[PDB]
RNA sequence: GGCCGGGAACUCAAAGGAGACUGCCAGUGAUAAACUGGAGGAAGGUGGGGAUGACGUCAAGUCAUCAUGGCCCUUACGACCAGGGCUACACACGUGCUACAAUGGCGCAUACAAAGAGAAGCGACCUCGCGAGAGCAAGCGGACCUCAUAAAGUGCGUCGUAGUCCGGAUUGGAGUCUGCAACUCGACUCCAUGAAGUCGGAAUCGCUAGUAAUCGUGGAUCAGAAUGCCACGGUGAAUACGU
RNA sequence: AGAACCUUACCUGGUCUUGACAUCCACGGAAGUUUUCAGAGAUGAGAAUGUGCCUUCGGGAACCGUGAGACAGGUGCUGCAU
């Protein structure tokens, strides 16, 4: 029912937040389907590292957006309040739909 | 080129200038910098001086210079050979 | 190279005849990685050749290979001072390689109608010792034995 | 009962189920012929059964995806081998000796900065 | 990088988002199949060119937010490649590390 | 085989032979054939004079060799006499459509002079 | 001019990031420029408070700043007046509610930013660069560090030809990724120009 | 129609683990290091690729990213604007792209990818237009929707070796879109045109495998504007005697 | 990692000068919105509103415009001072 999509830049942080959410549930009520991995976005950038010329000297950086989906079904409505009012891990974006 | 659904292009300063000219005499060269403005049929007989970058080239407009822009008759680069 | 003993490529046998030699021929004739085109050409050419020869595709192919295949080749080299032509024997794998390469080059020359027909004509001319791949082998064998003094 | 083998080759992945049957070969709801127009790809797909027992003995239901024609043919051969090893495991040595069990893990090299296509260098000039 | 040119960029951004939604509706008129095709759609072509040129967003340049550099810009970060590399090495950019594959 | 004042070749398919008309390309050629009802894959020799003169009065709907040549000549002469930028480019024998002139423009320029 | 940034190369492995927040591409550059303004302001303010790090976090429309400093008493002041001044003048430029926390650096002699800052301050006060470098090296090695490298570059001692001088002591394995290498730079603006100091401090692996 | 119920097997996703260590066998070796084969193993000995660039060198490059000592200008070397220029063209060089064709061109039909991007953004479907596109307009901040038909390939015809049904420069005309604005000086489309070019002198470059070669795809920059750059997959070689 | 304008640093011409961009003073004052004319535009002239948690009526933050000077500004030079 309720879809919680978590995205972070660090997989350890997103896994800690996901465990946090799925054990915030299972205490207020059952019926959480479990976290789905979801493909990680790897956004790459390729910049020149010299201030002048040297075209072929480049640094290649990337940001890895990690993405989890919890998919908590049939809320207890003791769980919706527990899942909101939380902005934990300070670096994990949370989108709670339905 | 400029799409048909948008009409031709002319700057309003040049438009008003050529209106005033075609209403009140064909004497002075209309000094314009708008090389990007299409030459309209109500500009025939005028002697519009179009900026070429450093001078104003005099262009006596004919009815054959209609589907064109003013800049096509004020060449900007100077080349006499090598 | 300078350091390594080169391990050799595993080549699959020909899917139509199970002949790794024919697969190597398809590879010699392939351009731009167009292996389907190469094997189509060689299959049409071997059909035409087996028709013109009566014998098997592989048998006529081997006959042409024998007739264009070299035994000795010159090498611009030296023991010291000046680099002259030294005739060296050709090992069998290089014999097959040079035969197939000279046949493919001769067939790419002498434009007839298409590559299949040109390859068939070259293979027939080779089986009867009159193509330009045969002349390649002949002038190779004459460069050698003109440089027979060196060894 | 139903012997499975995955198989992967060059961006391609197969899923090969085999059963005791009478020669069925279906790839993505198509026969071997109407799926692989390439004689070489069909030869590859049939190699691991030509090696042991293909006359009719097995029915192959294969779902392959990713990669191109030869990639899918190689992934299919790998999956067939992996399934045959789950059915008369004693064929493992006979397969290994012909190959067919090695994953064949040679992938496309990534393009590298300053290079054209990961080894092609751009036309050096002295002066 | 020429405080004057950084000020030009500030002015252009302010002018563009000021005259927005007016330039937008004039362009909507000009792009409309309707509007008489001779009077409204023609006077809109003149109103648009009487609006200040710097109000057209096609005149902004996307300089680096720190150095005002017009080239080598990256929209994800808002900085030129040089400052992006500096911040990324200092760890200022979250999650951005050296990529290898 | 003598359409539009010229001598389009037989032993060629009709689409290919019609393109020999100055002013008829592939598209106009197949349009002419579709209006005349003639298969594109037939040779001009394999036609009957009714088919050929229907081809003639179908090509007649298009500006062709002499008409088109003089039309283009008047376009270029108009530009040159007007003295616009394109006219000056046509005069001096330089690219007209804003192409590179520093290194290339051999087609519009001729072979290298020195 | 050929070495990778140590912190940058170890950002994934052993060193942490200095900004800890997730943004989409929409507000990413905005958060980045806001962090730049915040760090610029805090550095210029606490230039005399021996600040080593400014960690930034954006938890749900707030801005949590964490000032790793060697003078926590000086950054806090009395009554918390200084931290509340900073919280106000940080929230103003961040556009969100601010929260300034302070982390005391127990060994300022083992902090590459504080060591480089001390060296550059000495160079501005015209202390001799060899003295400054050797002092920092010995201080770190005696306070306990498996290695330290100090490097100064520029018109050292006002010389007309710039040169690089560096002192190593112990181990500074730069190619080892698991190595905990605190690296940081600073620049002294002397009457002769800029002199660049960069300090590596090794503190063991894993 | 994975379309639905359903299953959690498989692919896949992405977290955590195992796995490769000369670990084992034999021989050689100074009884050493190591080397040579072999087994098993998905992989074999730094498995493949990347990142990682010692002390220094070239007073190499960058004062025009930035910062900065000094010097210099400060009713101007600062600042604003319009138009022009950076696109000039007797020439020379570098790097590319497309060709010279039949292992191909064209037409019809039909397979198989990967990796990405997307909110004044990507924009299905439907309608209109030969087309570029337009109108209307869902969906999508996304393993969901869109970009987005991969192409080479394969099958079937045709062309039949011609400067050609090769080549697609150039030029004329007619347009579309972006943008205040397409003349200088955009990209693209359609019609017409059909240039040089027949495989390139002395020379010279890259590459040891999924590499070269060839085929398409995406992205950054970006209103628009790549044959460049960065990335992705498809097909897929030849050869290494040796010094 | 993308010059039509912009970019842009160059040229011609039209302009400004404590200035396009900061801080500091005093003077008059809300910020904004619409609009007319002339001009290539820069810009120069002209027309109704508008009276904010600080009004202790003193004054005030914001945003202006105007004067004078510290200054600001420089993609000006030196990469052989860094
Ligand atoms: Mg995505
Ligand atoms: Mg290059
Ligand atoms: Mg490739
Ligand atoms: Mg722009
Ligand atoms: Mg700037
Ligand atoms: Mg024609
Ligand atoms: Mg120098
Ligand atoms: Mg220089
Ligand atoms: Mg000036
Ligand atoms: Mg200008
Ligand atoms: Mg210009
Ligand atoms: Mg240039
Ligand atoms: Mg053609
Ligand atoms: Mg021709
Ligand atoms: Mg010729
Ligand atoms: Mg090598
Ligand atoms: Mg070989
Ligand atoms: Mg001036
Ligand atoms: Mg130097
Ligand atoms: Mg330097």
Give the chain E residue whose CA is nearest to the CA of G33. E65
CA distance G70 to G112: 12
What are the tokens at E5? 């040119």
Question: Cβ contacts (< 8 Å) between A87 and chain G: which residues?
Answer: 59-60
The 3-state DSSP class for residue E92 equals coil
Do G111 and G53 lie in a common domain?
no
Do G196 and G119 lie in a common domain?
yes
Which residues fall within 8 angstroms of residue B14, CB to CB, at 6 or more apart? Answer: B30, B32, B34, B37, B48, B70
User: Which residue has the least CA–C1' distance to nucleotide H113?
Assistant: D67
Please judge whether E30 and B11 are an interchain contact, meaning their C-beta atoms are less than 8 angstroms apart.
Answer: no
CA distance G169 to G145: 9
- HEC sequence for E7-45: HHHHHHHHHHHHHCCCHHHHHHHHHCCCCCCCCHHHHHH
**Diameter over CA atoms, chain F:** 57
What are the tokens at C98? 């040079």
CA distance C117 to C42: 10
Please report the number of interchain residue pairs, chain B to chain E, with beta-carbon separation below 8 angstroms.
13
Domain assignment present for residue G130? The answer is yes
Contact G99, G55 (CB under 8 A): no
The 3-state DSSP class for residue B12 equals helix
Nearest residue to G19 (alpha-carbon basis) of G5, G33, G1, G9: G33
Nearest residue to E27 (alpha-carbon basis) of E14, E10, E46, E5: E46
Please judge whether G57 and A91 are an interchain contact, meaning their C-beta atoms are less than 8 angstroms apart.
Answer: yes
Do chains A and C meet with 3 or more Cβ pairs nearer than 8 Å?
no
Nearest residue to D25 (alpha-carbon basis) of D58, D1, D74, D53: D58
CA distance G179 to A71: 40
Instruction: State in Å: Cα G186 to ligand 9 middle.
Output: 36
Residue E54, nucleotide of least CA–C1' distance: I6
Do G85 and G116 lie in a common domain?
no
Q: Which of B2, B4, B6, B18 would best serve as a mutation to test chain E binding (most E beta carbons within 10 A)? A: B6
Give chain H positions with protein CB within 7 A: 9-16, 37, 40-43, 47-57, 59-70, 78-96, 102-104, 111-120, 134-135, 141-143, 150-155, 158-161, 165, 169-187, 190-196, 204-215, 220-223, 229-243
Do chains G and B meet with 3 or more Cβ pairs nearer than 8 Å?
no
Contact G63, G98 (CB under 8 A): yes
- The distance (Å) linking the CA of F100 with the C1' of H81 is 31
What are the tokens at A6? 């978590």
Contact C26, C13 (CB under 8 A): no
Question: How far, in Å, are D1, D4, D16, D25 from residue D63 at the CA level?
Answer: 18, 11, 7, 11
Per the structure, the complete domain to which residue B67 belongs is given by: 2-82
CA distance B73 to F82: 9
DSSP β-ladder status, C84-89 and D8-9: unpaired
- The distance (Å) linking the CA of B15 with the C1' of I50 is 38
CA distance G51 to G67: 7
Instruction: State in Å: Cα F61 to ligand 13 middle.
Output: 25
Domain layout of chain A by residue ranges: 1-98
Q: Is F21 annotated as a binding residue?
A: yes
Do G176 and G138 lie in a common domain?
yes
Q: Is D69 exposed, middle or buried (0-12, 13-18, 19+ CB in 10 A)?
A: middle
**Angle between helical axes of C57-68 and C35-53 (0-180°, round to 10):** 90
Nearest residue to G193 (alpha-carbon basis) of G150, G162, G151: G162
Contact D36, D69 (CB under 8 A): yes
Do G116 and G193 lie in a common domain?
yes
DSSP β-ladder status, D8-9 and D12-20: antiparallel
Please judge whether D114 and A60 are an interchain contact, meaning their C-beta atoms are less than 8 angstroms apart.
Answer: no
CA distance G20 to A3: 25
- Chain B segment 14-53 residues within 8 A of E by beta carbon are 15
CA distance F16 to F26: 7
Domain assignment present for residue G3? The answer is no
Q: Is F24 annotated as a binding residue?
A: yes
- Residue ranges of alpha helices (H) inside F3-45 are 14-18, 26-36
Q: What's the angle, vertex CA D84, arms to CA D79 and CA D89, rounded to 5?
A: 130
State the nearest Cα–Cα gap between A2 and chain E, in angstroms: 28
Residue F101, nucleotide of least CA–C1' distance: H89
The 3-state DSSP class for residue D127 equals coil
CA distance B44 to B61: 5
F93 touches chain B (CB under 8 A): no
From G18, G23, G32, residue closest to E90, measured CB to CB? G18
Domain assignment present for residue G39? The answer is yes
Residue E46, nucleotide of least CA–C1' distance: H180
Do G151 and G64 lie in a common domain?
no
Contact C10, C2 (CB under 8 A): no
Do G75 and G151 lie in a common domain?
no
Please judge whether G8 and E91 are an interchain contact, meaning their C-beta atoms are less than 8 angstroms apart.
Answer: yes
Please judge whether B64 and F82 are an interchain contact, meaning their C-beta atoms are less than 8 angstroms apart.
Answer: yes
Please tell me what DSSP assigns to residue D34: H
Question: Cβ contacts (< 8 Å) between D42 and chain C: which residues?
Answer: 15
Contacts made by residues B9-14, CB under 8 angstroms, sequence distance 24+: B9/B36, B9/B37, B9/B38, B9/B69, B9/E45, B10/B34, B10/B37, B10/B38, B10/B40, B11/B36, B11/B37, B11/E49, B12/E46, B12/E49, B12/E50, B14/B48, B14/B70
Instruction: State in Å: Cα F106 to ligand 15 middle.
Output: 14
- Residue ranges of alpha helices (H) inside A1-98 are 11-24, 79-83
Nearest residue to D5 (alpha-carbon basis) of D107, D91, D98, D101: D101
Where a domain ends, among G76, G106, G136?
G106
| Breakpoints of chain F, after residues (C–N > 2.5 Å) | none
Which residues fall within 8 angstroms of residue B68, CB to CB, at 6 or more apart? Answer: B38, B39, F84
CA distance C47 to C54: 10
Report the phi/psi class of residue G154: left, alpha or beta, with left for phi > 0 and alpha for psi in -120 to 50.
left
Which residues fall within 8 angstroms of residue E64, CB to CB, at 6 or more apart? Answer: E72, E73, E78, E79, E80, E82, E83
- Which residues make up the environment of ion ligand 5, defined by Cβ < 5 Å? E 1, 6, 63, 68
From E45, E46, E50, residue closest to B6, measured CB to CB? E45
Report the phi/psi class of residue G192: left, alpha or beta, with left for phi > 0 and alpha for psi in -120 to 50.
alpha
Give, in words, the CATH class of F2-65: mainly alpha
CA distance F31 to F29: 5
The 3-state DSSP class for residue C119 equals helix
CA distance C48 to C28: 19
Give bridge partners of residue C76 from the DSSP assignment.
C85
Q: What's the angle, vertex CA A10, arms to CA A8 and CA A13, rounded to 5?
A: 80
CA distance G44 to G83: 15
Question: Cβ contacts (< 8 Å) between G24 and chain A: which residues?
Answer: 93
In the PDB record, what is the listed experimental method? cryo-EM
Q: Is F103 annotated as a binding residue?
A: no
State the nearest Cα–Cα gap between F27 and chain B, in angstroms: 25
The CB density around residue D46, as the number of other CB atoms within 10 Å, is 20
Question: Cβ contacts (< 8 Å) between G20 and chain A: which residues?
Answer: 90-91
Please tell me what DSSP assigns to residue G58: -
Domains and CATH numbers, chain C: 20-147 (1.10.455.10)
CA Rg, chain F, in Å? 19
Q: Which helix (H) or strand (E) holds C31?
A: none
φ and ψ at E7, to 5 degrees?
Answer: -65, -40
- The distance (Å) linking the CA of C23 with the C1' of H35 is 36
DSSP string, D75-121: HHHHHHHHHHTTSSGGGHHHHHHH-SSS-----PPPP-TTSSSSS--
- The distance (Å) linking the CA of F34 with the C1' of H172 is 26
CA distance B51 to B34: 7
Chains in contact with F via at least 3 Cβ–Cβ pairs below 8 Å = B
What are the tokens at E67? 């150095």
Question: How far, in Å, are B34, E62, E73, G58 from residue E54 at the CA level?
Answer: 18, 14, 21, 35
Torsion sign across C-alpha atoms D22, D27, D32, D34 = positive
CA distance D42 to D30: 13
Please judge whether B12 and E50 are an interchain contact, meaning their C-beta atoms are less than 8 angstroms apart.
Answer: yes
Chains in contact with D via at least 3 Cβ–Cβ pairs below 8 Å = A, C
Please judge whether D44 and C36 are an interchain contact, meaning their C-beta atoms are less than 8 angstroms apart.
Answer: no
- The distance (Å) linking the CA of C31 with the C1' of H198 is 21
Contact A1, A72 (CB under 8 A): yes
Per the structure, the complete domain to which residue G114 belongs is given by: 107-206
| Breakpoints of chain A, after residues (C–N > 2.5 Å) | none
CA distance G143 to G47: 24
Contact G200, G111 (CB under 8 A): no
CA distance F87 to F98: 13
Give the chain E residue whose CA is nearest to the CA of A64. E95
Give chain I positions with protein CB within 7 A: 1-9, 11-13, 20-21, 33-34, 38-42, 72-75, 79, 81-82
Please judge whether F84 and B64 are an interchain contact, meaning their C-beta atoms are less than 8 angstroms apart.
Answer: no
Question: How far, in Å, are A53, F70, F77, F79, F80 from residue F73 at the CA level?
Answer: 49, 5, 6, 10, 10
Contact G148, G178 (CB under 8 A): no
φ and ψ at G167, to 5 degrees?
Answer: -120, 130
Contact C35, C24 (CB under 8 A): no
CA distance F105 to E67: 41
φ and ψ at A92, to 5 degrees?
Answer: -110, 120
CA distance E32 to E34: 5
Looking at the 3D structure of chain B, how many domains does it have?
1
- Chain D segment 26-65 residues within 8 A of C by beta carbon are 38-40, 42-44
The 3-state DSSP class for residue A94 equals strand
Please tell me what DSSP assigns to residue C116: H
Please tell me what DSSP assigns to residue G27: T
Nearest residue to A88 (alpha-carbon basis) of A15, A1, A3, A2: A15
Q: Which of D33, D38, D40 would best serve as a mutation to test chain C binding (most C beta carbons within 10 A)? A: D40
CA distance G160 to G58: 47
Which residues fall within 8 angstroms of residue B76, CB to CB, at 6 or more apart? Answer: B52, B53
State the nearest Cα–Cα gap between A97 and chain E, in angstroms: 25
Please tell me what DSSP assigns to residue A43: E
Domain assignment present for residue G5? The answer is no
- The distance (Å) linking the CA of B32 with the C1' of H79 is 25
φ and ψ at F102, to 5 degrees?
Answer: -70, -40
Which residues fall within 8 angstroms of residue D27, CB to CB, at 6 or more apart? Answer: D35, D36, D45, D62, D63, D64, D76
- The distance (Å) linking the CA of D122 with the C1' of H11 is 40
Give the chain G residue whose CA is nearest to the CA of E79. G29
> What is the b/e burial string over G122-145, where b = at least 16 CB atoms within 10 angstroms of the residue's CB?
bbeeeeebeebbebbbebbbeeeb
Give bridge partners of residue A58 from the DSSP assignment.
A48
Contact E81, A59 (CB under 8 A): no
Q: Right CATH number for A1-98 from 3.30.70.600, 3.20.20.70, 3.50.50.60, 3.10.20.30?
A: 3.30.70.600
From F82, F85, F86, residue closest to B65, measured CB to CB? F82
Resolution of the deposited coordinates, in angstroms?
2.6
């Amino acid at each position: 029912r309720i879809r919680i999509r978590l995205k972070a830049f660090d997989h350890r942080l997103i896994d800690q937040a996901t465990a946090e959410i799925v054990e915030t549930a299972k205490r207020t009520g059952a019926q959480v389907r479990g976290p789905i991995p979801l493909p990680t976005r790897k956004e790459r950038f390729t910049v020149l590292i010299s201030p002048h010329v040297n075209k072929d000297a480049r640094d290649q950086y990337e940001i890895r957006t990690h993405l989890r989906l919890v998919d908590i079904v049939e809320p207890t409505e003791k769980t919706v309040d527990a899942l909101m009012r939380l902005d934990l891990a300070a670096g994990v974006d949370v989108q709670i739909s339905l | 080129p400029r799409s048909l659904k948008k009409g031709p292009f002319i700057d309003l300063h040049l438009l008003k200038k050529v209106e005033k000219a075609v209403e009140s005499g064909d004497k002075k060269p209309l000094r314009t910098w708008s090389r990007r403005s299409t030459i309209f049929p109500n500009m025939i007989g005028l002697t519009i001086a179009v900026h070429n970058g450093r001078q104003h080239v005099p262009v006596f407009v004919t009815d054959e210079m209609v589907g064109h822009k003013l800049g096509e008759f004020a060449p900007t680069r100077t080349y006499r050979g090598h | 190279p300078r350091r390594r003993v080169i391990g050799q490529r595993k080549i699959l046998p020909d899917p139509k005849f199970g002949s790794e030699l024919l697969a190597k021929f398809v590879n010699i004739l392939m351009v731009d990685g167009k292996k389907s085109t190469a094997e189509s050409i060689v299959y049409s050419a071997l059909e035409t050749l087996a028709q013109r020869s009566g014998k098997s595709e592989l048998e006529a192919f081997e006959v042409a290979l024998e007739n264009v295949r070299p035994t000795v080749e010159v090498k611009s080299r030296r023991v010291g001072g000046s680099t002259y032509q030294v005739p060296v024997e050709v090992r069998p794998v290089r014999r097959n390689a040079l035969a197939m390469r000279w046949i493919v080059e001769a067939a790419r020359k002498r434009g007839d109608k298409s590559m299949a027909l040109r390859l068939a004509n070259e293979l027939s001319d080779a089986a009867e010792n009159k193509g330009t791949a045969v002349k390649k082998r002949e002038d190779v064998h004459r460069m050698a034995e003109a440089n027979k003094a060196f060894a | 009962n139903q012997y499975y083998g995955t198989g992967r080759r060059k961006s391609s992945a197969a899923r090969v189920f085999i059963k005791p049957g009478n020669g069925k070969i279906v790839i993505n709801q198509r026969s071997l012929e109407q799926y692989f127009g390439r004689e070489t790809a069909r030869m590859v797909v049939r190699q691991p059964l030509e090696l042991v027992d293909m006359v009719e003995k097995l029915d192959l239901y294969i779902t392959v995806k990713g990669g191109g024609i030869s990639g899918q043919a190689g992934a299919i051969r790998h999956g067939i081998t992996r399934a045959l090893m789950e059915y008369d495991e004693s064929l493992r040595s006979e397969l290994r000796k012909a190959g067919f069990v090695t994953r064949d893990a040679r992938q496309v090299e990534r393009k590298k900065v300053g290079l054209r296509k990961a080894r092609r260098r751009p036309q050096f000039s002295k002066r | 990088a020429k405080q004057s040119m950084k000020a030009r960029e500030v002015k252009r951004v302010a002018l563009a988002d000021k005259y927005f939604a007016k330039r937008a509706e004039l362009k909507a008129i000009i792009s409309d199949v309707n509007a008489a095709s001779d009077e409204d759609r023609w006077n809109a072509v003149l109103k648009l060119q009487t609006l200040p040129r710097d109000s057209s967003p096609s005149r902004q340049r996307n300089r680096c937010r720190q150095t005002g550099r017009p080239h080598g810009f990256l929209r994800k970060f808002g900085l030129s490649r040089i400052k992006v590399r500096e911040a990324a090495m200092r760890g200022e950019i979250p999650g951005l590390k050296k990529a290898s594959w | 085989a003598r359409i539009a004042g010229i001598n389009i070749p037989d032993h060629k398919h009709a689409v290919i032979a019609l393109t020999s008309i100055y002013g008829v390309g592939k598209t106009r050629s197949k349009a002419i054939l579709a209006a005349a009802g003639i298969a594109e894959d037939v040779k001009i020799s394999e036609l009957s004079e009714g088919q050929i003169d229907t081809l003639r009065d179908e090509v007649a709907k298009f500006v062709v060799e002499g008409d088109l040549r003089r039309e283009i000549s008047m376009s270029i002469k108009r530009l040159m006499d007007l003295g616009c930028y394109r006219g000056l480019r046509h005069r001096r024998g330089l690219p007209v459509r804003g192409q590179r002139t520093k290194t290339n423009a051999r087609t519009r320029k001729g072979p290298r002079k020195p | 001019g050929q070495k990778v940034h140590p912190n940058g190369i170890r950002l994934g492995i052993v060193k942490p990031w200095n900004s800890t927040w997730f943004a989409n591409t929409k507000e990413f550059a905005d958060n980045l420029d806001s962090d730049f303004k915040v760090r610029q302001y805090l550095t210029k303010e606490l230039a005399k408070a021996s600040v080593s790090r400014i960690v930034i976090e954006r938890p749900a429309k707030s801005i949590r700043v964490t000032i790793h400093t060697a003078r926590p008493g000086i950054v806090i002041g009395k009554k918390g007046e200084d931290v509340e001044k900073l919280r106000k003048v940080v929230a103003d430029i961040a556009g969100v509610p601010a929260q300034i926390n302070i982390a005391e650096v127990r060994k300022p002699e083992l902090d590459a930013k504080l060591v480089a800052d001390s060296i550059t301050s000495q160079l501005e006060r015209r202390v001799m660069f060899r003295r400054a470098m050797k002092r920092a090296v010995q201080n770190a090695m005696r306070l306990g560090a498996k290695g330290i490298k100090v490097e100064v570059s520029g018109r050292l001692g006002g010389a007309e030809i710039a040169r690089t001088e560096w002192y190593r002591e112990g181990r500074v394995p730069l190619h080892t990724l698991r190595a905990d290498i605190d690296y940081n730079t600073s620049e002294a603006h002397t009457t002769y120009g800029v002199i660049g100091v960069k300090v590596w401090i090794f503190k063991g692996e894993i």
